[PDB]
Write a protein that binds this DNA or RNA. Structure first.
Lengths: 97, 64, 76
RNA sequence: CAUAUAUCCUGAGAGGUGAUGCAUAGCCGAGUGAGGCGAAUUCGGUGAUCCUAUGCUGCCGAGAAAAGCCUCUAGCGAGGAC
RNA sequence: UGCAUCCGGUGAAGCCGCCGAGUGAUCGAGUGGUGGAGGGUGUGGGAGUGAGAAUGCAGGCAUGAGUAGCGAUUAGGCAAGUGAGAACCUUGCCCGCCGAAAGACCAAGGGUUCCUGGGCCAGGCCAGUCCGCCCAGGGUGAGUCGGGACCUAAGGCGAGGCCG
RNA sequence: GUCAACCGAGCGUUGAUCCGAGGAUGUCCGAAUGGGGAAACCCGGCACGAGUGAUGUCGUGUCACCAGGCGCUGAAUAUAUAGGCGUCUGGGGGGAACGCGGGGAAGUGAAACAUCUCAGUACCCGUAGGAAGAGAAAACAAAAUGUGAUUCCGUGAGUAGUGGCGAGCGAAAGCGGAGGAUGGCUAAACCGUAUGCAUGUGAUACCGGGUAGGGGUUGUGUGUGCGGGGUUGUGGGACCUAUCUUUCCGGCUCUACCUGGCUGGAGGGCAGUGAGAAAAUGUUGUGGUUAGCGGAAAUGGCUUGGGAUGGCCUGCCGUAGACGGUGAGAGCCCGGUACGUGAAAACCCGACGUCUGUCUUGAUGGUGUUCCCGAGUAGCAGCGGGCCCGUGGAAUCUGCUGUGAAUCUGCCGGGACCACCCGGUAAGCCUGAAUACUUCCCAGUGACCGAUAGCGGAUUAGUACCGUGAGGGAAUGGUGAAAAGUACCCCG
């Protein structure tokens, strides 16, 4: 069988100045599965943090082509999901900001 | 962490519950690692192995 | 020629020209003749590309038994 | 039955609203740049290669399709529209 | 290489020399140096067996030569700074150039070149504290934009099919 | 895991890492197959399930085309078919070489060139299999009481011959050998049964004789299927026929009656997963393969040396002195070697049997006539191909087109052809071994290369790079025994 936990889509959070500022604005950015979609992510986030999500915005980020003696090498093309919770939304603690 | 010997005692529903719990632990651990709040990095491999064992057991019960 | 169905006669290949023994290649295509074959059990006529030898033999054996052998081979 | 400054449609643009907002010339210190306050905002003129315009006129060389939209019924129909 | 012998970390080969030898290719179980591990001799066997030339091939290095050139038609300068180091980087003030462009925005194409921080033996036709260079990290948020999920043109693929 | 360390975490005799086998999972593309598509990315339908206040969303399955069966339906249109719907089974593509069948160059050589050669090469196409193909005489041979499937090897022989008789090409028989299965089935004629089609002294006609029913052992024909029966050349086989005649029982044998064939059961053989019919099933082989394990004998002395694996001297093992490693030439330090062990499971070979098939109502050997012995075939002609044979007197074989027979006193071949004689018995099928090859795997070898060599590739290798693309296509090895990889100070 397969268990479609919503936590398989949500891979990791993003830790950056921009992510922290958006956290102050109550907007949390995650690294999601590249084959996911906004509605899937909304449902997953809701089921995970027991919260209500206003919008979800996705940006696909190509991988950096880094060089080496062998030649060149490319990192992974990630997918970021920026998630605006609703007004109150009982915010998240798991980011360790 | 847990053994197949002691996973085969459990039921399908207990296994699925343990699977959900292990996926939750893995989620929390990925977040801890991203934030730097994880010393024990091997918990991730451990939990992935637990998930694999559980899926293996369930498929084994499905087939024979 | 159009590569018969009941008898499978395909073209032979060779080289034909004299007076210098040049031997430029050609083909010796069969006498394929469009024929509307009917099966008096079902009296409708389907257009086939068959050989003249096939026609002679199939007038010898009737359309029926040779059509049995033909459908047994499975060709259309 | 009518030839209608009738009616309908289309439609630039004007005006209103949007706008008690926003922005701004400038002013305060602050000097990394964080901010804060904030005047009047009427008249004309010129004037598009842009809009009305997928128009109008003229011409021959005689100028995409399909979706879409509208309508028709066939049909569905006991719930349905606004 | 077969066989038999011999030498060798008490220093083989290779390389550089000295002193010499042979009619010649060449020799040196004569010597030193360097070096560090396999070689010599005789007798046979077999050869990828000998290069100076092929406008030969590859590599390295010369000659020209510290020579030409250092890539437009705009033009740079002063002060101050930074720094080991400044014609070139930074700031300010001047001057000058474009101004249907040498401005601003897109497509195509490129693909991270963007931003921040750091660096400076390569690159930049000089130098370089600078950089489109190097390193690390970050960065691209769409119901309405451009596209798909709507439509078809040319044209393409083309169930079956026909023809071959 | 590693380049390739470092950091941080941990695991492990409760047996990790690692090795082998079997399984599970196995995104997306790709035959690619739900549909689309610029391959690896876009859009879905249906069913089930989850999730939502519901739409959205998620997951699991499934959904290509074609062929062949099976079932339903059966257009114009009536028969009916084409077709449509459903289901099931399969294919599709890749692969280094080898194979079979087809197609088929040119450079070149001929000192030109066209015939010819190159060459049936390269290339292409279609197809396979682990081998293939061929193969059980319508053969060879030459009068020998001959051989006796096929393939392959060597010879025959660079011969006979062929050839613008030029360049060149080039057999076969026969012989010696490999391997041996001189192997096995069938169609036909006759019966029997079933069935389709058309019909019916429709009864004196449907078993074998005679009686009686029966209204058909159809009056039948005719075609097909099935089963028998028959598979050959000294011709054989069938139909008739006659002598002998190895098992038992039952039911039919149109019907009951005596007597002639068939069909079931039983003892038994005979074979078998094979070409000769086909699967499954077990038990079981210190049989094998896929991990490995053990495995003798020097801390020997002296000396040199950084180090002994060198030298000198002592011993020792040896079914082990093979090859490597270890601080320099190590049998006795290590991995190992000789040698010997080892498989839970999977797989492959066997054996034993279940089981399957067949014979078993059977054969034996004889006598004289009709029937059969593979048909659009052979043969013939025309044009061609290939055979040594280049159309020549050109057989044999073979493609196309026409024409077109005979079934044994028949036909084919024995190098035009005729006669005789001999051999064989086409037009139907199958068939192992000897033979060819190596993408890949294992173990090994080299008077093979040893980094401009050897694979292009010891290294980032079909990479970087070049090119739109097909495609082309590099260079780059060595510290040292051990990083002990130069702390620290000085110039900078």
């Amino acid at each position: 069988a397969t268990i479609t936990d919503p936590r398989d889509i949500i891979l990791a959070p993003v830790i950056s100045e921009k992510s922290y500022g958006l956290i102050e604005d109550n907007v949390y950015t995650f690294v999601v599965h590249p084959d996911s979609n906004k509605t899937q992510i909304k449902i997953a986030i809701e089921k995970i943090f027991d919260v209500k999500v206003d919008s979800v915005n996705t940006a696909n980020r190509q991988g950096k082509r880094k060089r080496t003696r062998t030649g060149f090498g490319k990192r992974k093309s990630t997918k970021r999901a920026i998630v605006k919770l609703a007004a109150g939304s009982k915010p998240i603690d798991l980011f360790g900001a | 962490g847990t053994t197949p010997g002691e996973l085969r005692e459990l039921t399908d529903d207990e296994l699925k519950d343990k699977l959900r719990e292990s996926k939750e632990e893995l989620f929390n651990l990925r977040f801890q690692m991203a934030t730097g709040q994880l010393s024990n990095n091997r918990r991730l491999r451990t939990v992935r192995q637990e998930i694999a064992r559980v899926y293996t057991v369930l498929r084994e019960r499905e087939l024979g | 020629s159009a590569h018969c169905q009941v008898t499978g006669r395909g073209p032979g290949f060779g080289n034909s020209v004299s007076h210098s023994h040049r031997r430029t290649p050609r083909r010796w295509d069969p006498n394929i003749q469009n024929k509307t074959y009917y099966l008096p059990s079902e009296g409708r006529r389907i257009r086939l590309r068959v050989s003249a030898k096939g026609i002679k033999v199939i007038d010898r054996d009737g359309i029926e038994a040779v059509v049995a052998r033909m459908r047994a081979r499975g060709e259309k």
